[PDB]
Design a protein around this ligand. Structure first.
Ligand code: NO2
Length: 129
């Protein structure tokens, strides 16, 4: 499913991401835009053999099992295909564990390079929240 900007913002708020670990809703919307273009079916292979999955591009090196990343971890205890659902519950719950892991949102390269230090509030502008 390809989410609209305000539709995603509302689902993320519903799921409790707004100000989670001090990151405002705009940060998560900005990250999702640049990681997956709001597409739940997004997948990208990494140079090391692992793969990023879903709207928040969660990677199989640590977080999920995709049956093809030998010697990796499954810290969110899920198949990576669960991250590709039209329902973002599994992605949001895994994102909460990632952001709590010590490095905050710097875990997302696209956030660090494209969202961090910018006016992220612009991403929830005009939305009925
Ligand atoms: O993602 N472990 O194959």
């Amino acid at each position: 499913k390809v989410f609209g900007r305000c539709e995603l913002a509302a689902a993320m708020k519903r799921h409790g991401l707004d100000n989670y670990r001090g990151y405002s809703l705009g940060n998560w919307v900005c990250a999702a835009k640049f990681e997956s273009n709001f597409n739940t079916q997004a997948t990208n292979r990494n140079t090391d053999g692992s793969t990023d999955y879903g709207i928040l591009q969660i990677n199989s090196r640590w977080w999920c099992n995709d049956g093809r990343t030998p010697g990796s971890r499954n810290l969110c205890n899920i198949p990576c295909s669960a991250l590709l659902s039209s329902d973002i519950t599994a992605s949001v719950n895994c994102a909460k564990k990632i952001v709590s892991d010590g490095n905050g949102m710097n875990a997302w390269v696209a956030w660090r390079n494209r969202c961090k230090g910018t006016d992220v509030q612009a991403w929830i502008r005009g939305c009925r929240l």
